[PDB]
Amino acid sequence: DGVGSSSGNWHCDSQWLGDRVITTSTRTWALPTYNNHLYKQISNSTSGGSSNDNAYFGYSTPWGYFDFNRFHCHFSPRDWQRLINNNWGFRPKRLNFKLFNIQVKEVTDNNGVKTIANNLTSTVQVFTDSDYQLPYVLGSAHEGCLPPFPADVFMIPQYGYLTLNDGSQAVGRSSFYCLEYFPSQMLRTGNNFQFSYEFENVPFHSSYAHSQSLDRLMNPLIDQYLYYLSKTINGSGQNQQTLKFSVAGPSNMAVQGRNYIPGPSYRQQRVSTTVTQNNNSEFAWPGASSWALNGRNSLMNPGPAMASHKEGEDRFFPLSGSLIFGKQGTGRDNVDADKVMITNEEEIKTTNPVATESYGQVATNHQSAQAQAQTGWVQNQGILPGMVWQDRDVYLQGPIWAKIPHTDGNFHPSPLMGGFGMKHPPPQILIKNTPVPADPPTAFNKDKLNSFITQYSTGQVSVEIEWELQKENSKRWNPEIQYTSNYYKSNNVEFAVNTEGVYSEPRPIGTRYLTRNL
Amino acid sequence: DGVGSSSGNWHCDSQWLGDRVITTSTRTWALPTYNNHLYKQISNSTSGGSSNDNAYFGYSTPWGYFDFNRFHCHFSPRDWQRLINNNWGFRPKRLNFKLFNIQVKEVTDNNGVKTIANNLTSTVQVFTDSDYQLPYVLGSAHEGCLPPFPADVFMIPQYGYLTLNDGSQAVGRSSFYCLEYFPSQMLRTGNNFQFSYEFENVPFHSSYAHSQSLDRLMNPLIDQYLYYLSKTINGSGQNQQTLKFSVAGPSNMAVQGRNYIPGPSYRQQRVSTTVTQNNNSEFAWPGASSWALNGRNSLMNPGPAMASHKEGEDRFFPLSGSLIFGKQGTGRDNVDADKVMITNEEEIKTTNPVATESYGQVATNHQSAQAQAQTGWVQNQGILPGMVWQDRDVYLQGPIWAKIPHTDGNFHPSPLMGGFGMKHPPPQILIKNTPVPADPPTAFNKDKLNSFITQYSTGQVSVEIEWELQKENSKRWNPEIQYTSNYYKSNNVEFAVNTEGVYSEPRPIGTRYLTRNL
Amino acid sequence: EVQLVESGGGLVQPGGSLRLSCAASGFIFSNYWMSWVRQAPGKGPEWVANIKQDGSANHYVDSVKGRFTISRDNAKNSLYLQMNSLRAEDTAVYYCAREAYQDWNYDYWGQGTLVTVSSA
Amino acid sequence: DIQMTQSPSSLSASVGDRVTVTCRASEFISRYLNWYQQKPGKAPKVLIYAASSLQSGVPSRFSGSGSGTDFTLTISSLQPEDFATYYCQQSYSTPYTFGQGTKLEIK
Known part of the structure; x- marks a missing residue:
C-alpha cells in the first residue's frame, strides 16, 4: 500500500479450543544477498577413499528460504507441557503464512565506515513451490528455522540442492534448476505476502506410553489350553530321548503362545556414558551400522525405531540410534558429552526390540542323533506378519514433518527422525532480494552486469498452524506420570533468559507421559 | 501508483496446452544515459579503397531499445527440446510486453568516491514504433537482447540508424529522425508500461528433416514408360553414328524423368576445418562470394539456403554460407576455430543443392559432325519452374523474425539468416532517461543546457509469446532421431552455470530431428 | 595406451624456481585427479x-605449502607443477x-624427471 | 596425518618360497591400501589395490588381505622377477602416505 503504513501486525499466542489448538508465531528476519546474485556449481573438494561416502555435486542459489519445521517454532514450553500431559495424540491440520513489513536497506561503505539507508523502491521476490517442482530440502533437520524464543531476530538460510553425482562429477541425468524461472511475487516496502496450506490426512502422533508389554498380555491367573514341548530326554544316560509336553500357564509366561510379536530391528552398537566401560579404540565410524547406496556408505541414523536401552541400564545409548541435540552455546566440532543432550526411546520398549540387542534366535540346522541343535543370533529382522511397533517420539526441538520420497513403493512412510510423513508437505517458501545494478557504463557492453548496490532486507514473518487433539479417555485409577518443573531453587529459571539475555532449552522434552493399554 | 508499491510481478515459465505453448520471460535491465542526451551524426572514419565497402552515414541517438528477437530469450533448453522432438512446425501468434518496477538512480561523484541515491521524481520515456516510421534495426542479428539465462542483468543497447550515404558524406535524400518527435509515455517509479501485439500470419517453420531425397521419389520396382537416349554410336570406328533408346528403370535411376528439380544455388567457396587441407594463401575476403549494390560489395552471408556439405564430408563448410556462433567468453577478433560454433544445413540436402558444388551442367554449343558436345558448369542458378527447396533452420541462439523490406516486389520473403519474415514485425520499443538539468545560471542564457545530473535507471521487463504448434502425424515404424543429453560424466552440466556462476550454451541446437516424407 | 610424460627437470641453485609439465595422451584428462x-x-x-579434475581444488603436503603451485590445463591435457624457493631436501625424482x-591408487605413472638442487 | 608402518624392512628368500609383508596404519583407512612393486630406475607399479583386489595383468601369485588398520601382502611361489622393493600406500586421505619399504633379496 504505502511507505508510511504498516502491512501487518504481530501475532504470537496459542488458542486452546476444545479438540483444537491454534498456535501463531511471529518473528523478525534479515535476508542478505547470497552468492552476489549468482547461481554456482558446487561439489566436494576432498580426495581419497574418505571422500567417496562424502562425495556430492549440486548448486547454491542466490535465494533464501523460510523453515518453520521444528516444534519449538510453534509451541512455547508451557504450551508443549499443556499438550503432552493432557492428550493421547495430535496432528497438524491447517497452515497460514504471512510475510509483511518489508524493509530494503542499502549499504554504502566508504573508507571503512558504513552507512545504511532505506531504499524505498527496491523489491524482494517470494514464491512458494506449490507443485513440488524444486528439490525439497526441508526434511533434513537443518538449521535456519525460526528461533524458539520470539524476541530473537534470525538470519534466513541460503537455498541449495544436490543432484546426481559420480564422485564430484555430474552425469547427463543431473538436473539444474533456475529459481528465476518460476513466477514470483515482487514486494516493495508497502506490499505483503500470504498463502494458506492444508495438511493432508496423517495419523495422530502417538503421544503416550504403553502400560503393558507385548509379552505380558495374558491373564496371569489362568492356564492356556495350548501345550509346549517341555522335555526331550528322561535324564542322564544313553538313549534317553522322549517327548514330554506341558501346559503353558502363569508359572512359565515365556513359553506361552502369543498372537503378536515385536517389530523389526537393525542392531546398533552400544556406547556407555561411563567412558571407562567403553573399549580403548576408535570405533565410532568403524563400528557403526550403515547402509550402502550406489557404492557409498551412509550411517544408519537414527534408523528404525528401537528402544534405546534395556530397563535399568540408562547409561548406554545406541551408537547412532538416537537424536542428539546440542545445549545452548555448544560448539560445532568434538564437544564433550555434557555439551549435548542425548534423547532416548525408552518408552517404546513394550513393543519394540532394544536397539543394542539381537532380535532373537533361530534354528540353524536339523538336530539329529548325530547332531545337536544349533541356534544363531538374529542381528537384523525385517517385517514379519504379526509385528507391532511404535514410531519414534517427537521433541520440542525436533522436526515436525518430512516429505515422503516419490517412489513406486514405500512401507510405513513415517519419517525416521520423527514426525509426520507427507506426500505433499508444507511447501518451500523461497525469498531473495532483487538485484539492483550500479551505474552501467555509458557505452554499450554485452556482458552481464557484475556491479550491484550492496543491499539487504528485513521484515516480519508470522506462521499459524491449527492442530487437532486426541484426548485421554483412560480408566486408570492411580495418577499418571506428568512432565513438570522442579521446585528446587536455581540461579536461572529453566526455559528463560539468563542475565545476558540468552534463551536456552535445558533439556529435550518428549511427548510420551500418559499411558494406554497395549 | 506509489513509491512503496510494486507495479508488477515476476513471470517466467512455459505453459504447454494442446497445440499452443506460451512462454514468458522476465529480466532485470539497466539503462544508462547515452551520448549525454544528444543526437550525433556518425560516419565511417576510414579512408582508402578498403573503406568503400564499409562506408556509412547515420546518427546515434540518446535512446535505448528492447530486443527479444533471439529464441533463447523465450525458451529454456528443456523447452526447446520439448518443442523440436515432438513437433513438425511452430510459429508465433501473440505478443505481450510489460515494463515495470522502474527505478531512477542519480550518481554524485565527489573526490573519486561515487554515491548512488534514488531520484524519486525522475521519469523514463518509452514508446513503441507501431507505425513502422523509424528505421528498423531489429532484423540485423545484433547483441543486446535479453540474456538466455533468467538470473542475468543486462544493459540496454543504444539505438542508432543509417541513412543514404555517398562515401562518408550524406545526400539530400538522406533522412534525419528525432525520436523526441514521437509521443511517448513518461514513467516515474510507480508507473508501468505495457502493450500487446498480434503476429501476422506466417507459415509454420518446418522443424523436420526429409526422409526421402528429391531424386529418389520413384518406385524402385517398376520401369518408367519413358525412354532416354542410351547410345549415340555403335562402337569404335568411322561413321558409327546411331540413335539408341532405353527404358529408364531401377537399374539406372539417374536418367529417369522427374517432375521436380532442386532449388536455387549461389556457389560458396569450401573451407576445411583441417587446416592442412586448405590453400596456403589469404583467400577469406578475396575468395568470397559477394553481391554489389551501388558500387559497394557485400559478402553473401549467409546467402541462399543450401546444404552445408556433401554426405560423408562434415569437415567442410561454406566460406560465408553458415551461421557461426561464439562460445561463452569468446573474444571479439581473430579467435580460433574451437572458440566458435559453426552450424550446418545438412538436413536440407534432400531438396537443396550443396553450397560448395555447382548446380549442374548445361550444353554450351551444338554438337555436329565437326564439333563435339561441350558442357559447362552452372555456378549460380536462379529460380526455375519446378524447383522445391527448404528454408534455413532456426536455432536456440538464432533470430526469430525479420522485417520484410518495403518494396515493389520480393520473392519468398523468408529471411536468409532464418526465422519468420513479416511486413509488420513486432515493433521497436524505445526507452531513454528523461534529462534532468543541473542548476542553471541565475541570469538568462539562450544556449541549450549542457549540464545535467548523472543518472541511470533499472527495472524489470517481461515478454510473453504464444506459439502455435504443428504436431507430428507420422506412420514411420522405426524410431526417430531425437535431440538428447549425453549420460557420460562431466565436470559441468550442459546448459547450466559453472563454479563461477557463468551460464553457457555448449552447442548450437537446430530444430530438425523428426522426419517427413518428401 | 595411457602415457604420462614429465619435462622441465634439471639442476638449479637453492632458492631457485622451476616449472614441471606433464603430458597425457591416453585418456580423458578431465575425468581424473592428478x-x-x-x-x-x-x-x-x-x-x-594433487589437483581436482576441473582444477577447482588442490592439496599440498605441509613441507612444500606456499612454495609450490599445482595447476591443470584441460584443453592441452597437461599438468603443471610450479616450484619456488627450492631446497637441498627438495631435490628428488x-x-x-x-x-x-x-x-584412488596410482594406476598410471609417468617416467619422471630428475630435479637437482645444488649449491654449486 | 596417518603413519604407515611396514614390516620387515628387509627380507631374503629363494625361488618358490612364500613371502609375507605386513603393513600397519595409525588410523582407520578402510580398504584404501595399495601395494606397489618397484625396480631400480622405474616408477612404482601397482600390484594390489583396495586391500584384497589384484591389478589386471599381474600374476595370480600376488595376494593381499586385511582391512581397517592391518594389512598383509602375500607372495606364493616366488620368482626371480619378484625381487624388488615393495611399498604399501594409503589412498584414504591426504597427504597420501607410503610405507618405508621392503626389499627382497636373491638366495
Missing part, C-alpha cells in the same frame, strides 16, 4: 600435491601420477 609424487635418492617415494577412479 598427483605429483617425488622420490628422493635412496628413499621411499613421497606425495607432493618427480613423478606425475594419475589417481584411479573409486579406488
Whole structure:
C-alpha cells in the first residue's frame, strides 16, 4: 500500500479450543544477498577413499528460504507441557503464512565506515513451490528455522540442492534448476505476502506410553489350553530321548503362545556414558551400522525405531540410534558429552526390540542323533506378519514433518527422525532480494552486469498452524506420570533468559507421559 | 501508483496446452544515459579503397531499445527440446510486453568516491514504433537482447540508424529522425508500461528433416514408360553414328524423368576445418562470394539456403554460407576455430543443392559432325519452374523474425539468416532517461543546457509469446532421431552455470530431428 | 595406451624456481585427479600435491605449502607443477601420477624427471 | 596425518618360497591400501589395490588381505622377477602416505 503504513501486525499466542489448538508465531528476519546474485556449481573438494561416502555435486542459489519445521517454532514450553500431559495424540491440520513489513536497506561503505539507508523502491521476490517442482530440502533437520524464543531476530538460510553425482562429477541425468524461472511475487516496502496450506490426512502422533508389554498380555491367573514341548530326554544316560509336553500357564509366561510379536530391528552398537566401560579404540565410524547406496556408505541414523536401552541400564545409548541435540552455546566440532543432550526411546520398549540387542534366535540346522541343535543370533529382522511397533517420539526441538520420497513403493512412510510423513508437505517458501545494478557504463557492453548496490532486507514473518487433539479417555485409577518443573531453587529459571539475555532449552522434552493399554 | 508499491510481478515459465505453448520471460535491465542526451551524426572514419565497402552515414541517438528477437530469450533448453522432438512446425501468434518496477538512480561523484541515491521524481520515456516510421534495426542479428539465462542483468543497447550515404558524406535524400518527435509515455517509479501485439500470419517453420531425397521419389520396382537416349554410336570406328533408346528403370535411376528439380544455388567457396587441407594463401575476403549494390560489395552471408556439405564430408563448410556462433567468453577478433560454433544445413540436402558444388551442367554449343558436345558448369542458378527447396533452420541462439523490406516486389520473403519474415514485425520499443538539468545560471542564457545530473535507471521487463504448434502425424515404424543429453560424466552440466556462476550454451541446437516424407 | 610424460627437470641453485609439465595422451584428462609424487635418492617415494579434475581444488603436503603451485590445463591435457624457493631436501625424482577412479591408487605413472638442487 | 608402518624392512628368500609383508596404519583407512612393486630406475607399479583386489595383468601369485588398520601382502611361489622393493600406500586421505619399504633379496 504505502511507505508510511504498516502491512501487518504481530501475532504470537496459542488458542486452546476444545479438540483444537491454534498456535501463531511471529518473528523478525534479515535476508542478505547470497552468492552476489549468482547461481554456482558446487561439489566436494576432498580426495581419497574418505571422500567417496562424502562425495556430492549440486548448486547454491542466490535465494533464501523460510523453515518453520521444528516444534519449538510453534509451541512455547508451557504450551508443549499443556499438550503432552493432557492428550493421547495430535496432528497438524491447517497452515497460514504471512510475510509483511518489508524493509530494503542499502549499504554504502566508504573508507571503512558504513552507512545504511532505506531504499524505498527496491523489491524482494517470494514464491512458494506449490507443485513440488524444486528439490525439497526441508526434511533434513537443518538449521535456519525460526528461533524458539520470539524476541530473537534470525538470519534466513541460503537455498541449495544436490543432484546426481559420480564422485564430484555430474552425469547427463543431473538436473539444474533456475529459481528465476518460476513466477514470483515482487514486494516493495508497502506490499505483503500470504498463502494458506492444508495438511493432508496423517495419523495422530502417538503421544503416550504403553502400560503393558507385548509379552505380558495374558491373564496371569489362568492356564492356556495350548501345550509346549517341555522335555526331550528322561535324564542322564544313553538313549534317553522322549517327548514330554506341558501346559503353558502363569508359572512359565515365556513359553506361552502369543498372537503378536515385536517389530523389526537393525542392531546398533552400544556406547556407555561411563567412558571407562567403553573399549580403548576408535570405533565410532568403524563400528557403526550403515547402509550402502550406489557404492557409498551412509550411517544408519537414527534408523528404525528401537528402544534405546534395556530397563535399568540408562547409561548406554545406541551408537547412532538416537537424536542428539546440542545445549545452548555448544560448539560445532568434538564437544564433550555434557555439551549435548542425548534423547532416548525408552518408552517404546513394550513393543519394540532394544536397539543394542539381537532380535532373537533361530534354528540353524536339523538336530539329529548325530547332531545337536544349533541356534544363531538374529542381528537384523525385517517385517514379519504379526509385528507391532511404535514410531519414534517427537521433541520440542525436533522436526515436525518430512516429505515422503516419490517412489513406486514405500512401507510405513513415517519419517525416521520423527514426525509426520507427507506426500505433499508444507511447501518451500523461497525469498531473495532483487538485484539492483550500479551505474552501467555509458557505452554499450554485452556482458552481464557484475556491479550491484550492496543491499539487504528485513521484515516480519508470522506462521499459524491449527492442530487437532486426541484426548485421554483412560480408566486408570492411580495418577499418571506428568512432565513438570522442579521446585528446587536455581540461579536461572529453566526455559528463560539468563542475565545476558540468552534463551536456552535445558533439556529435550518428549511427548510420551500418559499411558494406554497395549 | 506509489513509491512503496510494486507495479508488477515476476513471470517466467512455459505453459504447454494442446497445440499452443506460451512462454514468458522476465529480466532485470539497466539503462544508462547515452551520448549525454544528444543526437550525433556518425560516419565511417576510414579512408582508402578498403573503406568503400564499409562506408556509412547515420546518427546515434540518446535512446535505448528492447530486443527479444533471439529464441533463447523465450525458451529454456528443456523447452526447446520439448518443442523440436515432438513437433513438425511452430510459429508465433501473440505478443505481450510489460515494463515495470522502474527505478531512477542519480550518481554524485565527489573526490573519486561515487554515491548512488534514488531520484524519486525522475521519469523514463518509452514508446513503441507501431507505425513502422523509424528505421528498423531489429532484423540485423545484433547483441543486446535479453540474456538466455533468467538470473542475468543486462544493459540496454543504444539505438542508432543509417541513412543514404555517398562515401562518408550524406545526400539530400538522406533522412534525419528525432525520436523526441514521437509521443511517448513518461514513467516515474510507480508507473508501468505495457502493450500487446498480434503476429501476422506466417507459415509454420518446418522443424523436420526429409526422409526421402528429391531424386529418389520413384518406385524402385517398376520401369518408367519413358525412354532416354542410351547410345549415340555403335562402337569404335568411322561413321558409327546411331540413335539408341532405353527404358529408364531401377537399374539406372539417374536418367529417369522427374517432375521436380532442386532449388536455387549461389556457389560458396569450401573451407576445411583441417587446416592442412586448405590453400596456403589469404583467400577469406578475396575468395568470397559477394553481391554489389551501388558500387559497394557485400559478402553473401549467409546467402541462399543450401546444404552445408556433401554426405560423408562434415569437415567442410561454406566460406560465408553458415551461421557461426561464439562460445561463452569468446573474444571479439581473430579467435580460433574451437572458440566458435559453426552450424550446418545438412538436413536440407534432400531438396537443396550443396553450397560448395555447382548446380549442374548445361550444353554450351551444338554438337555436329565437326564439333563435339561441350558442357559447362552452372555456378549460380536462379529460380526455375519446378524447383522445391527448404528454408534455413532456426536455432536456440538464432533470430526469430525479420522485417520484410518495403518494396515493389520480393520473392519468398523468408529471411536468409532464418526465422519468420513479416511486413509488420513486432515493433521497436524505445526507452531513454528523461534529462534532468543541473542548476542553471541565475541570469538568462539562450544556449541549450549542457549540464545535467548523472543518472541511470533499472527495472524489470517481461515478454510473453504464444506459439502455435504443428504436431507430428507420422506412420514411420522405426524410431526417430531425437535431440538428447549425453549420460557420460562431466565436470559441468550442459546448459547450466559453472563454479563461477557463468551460464553457457555448449552447442548450437537446430530444430530438425523428426522426419517427413518428401 | 595411457602415457604420462614429465619435462622441465634439471639442476638449479637453492632458492631457485622451476616449472614441471606433464603430458597425457591416453585418456580423458578431465575425468581424473592428478598427483605429483617425488622420490628422493635412496628413499621411499613421497606425495607432493594433487589437483581436482576441473582444477577447482588442490592439496599440498605441509613441507612444500606456499612454495609450490599445482595447476591443470584441460584443453592441452597437461599438468603443471610450479616450484619456488627450492631446497637441498627438495631435490628428488618427480613423478606425475594419475589417481584411479573409486579406488584412488596410482594406476598410471609417468617416467619422471630428475630435479637437482645444488649449491654449486 | 596417518603413519604407515611396514614390516620387515628387509627380507631374503629363494625361488618358490612364500613371502609375507605386513603393513600397519595409525588410523582407520578402510580398504584404501595399495601395494606397489618397484625396480631400480622405474616408477612404482601397482600390484594390489583396495586391500584384497589384484591389478589386471599381474600374476595370480600376488595376494593381499586385511582391512581397517592391518594389512598383509602375500607372495606364493616366488620368482626371480619378484625381487624388488615393495611399498604399501594409503589412498584414504591426504597427504597420501607410503610405507618405508621392503626389499627382497636373491638366495
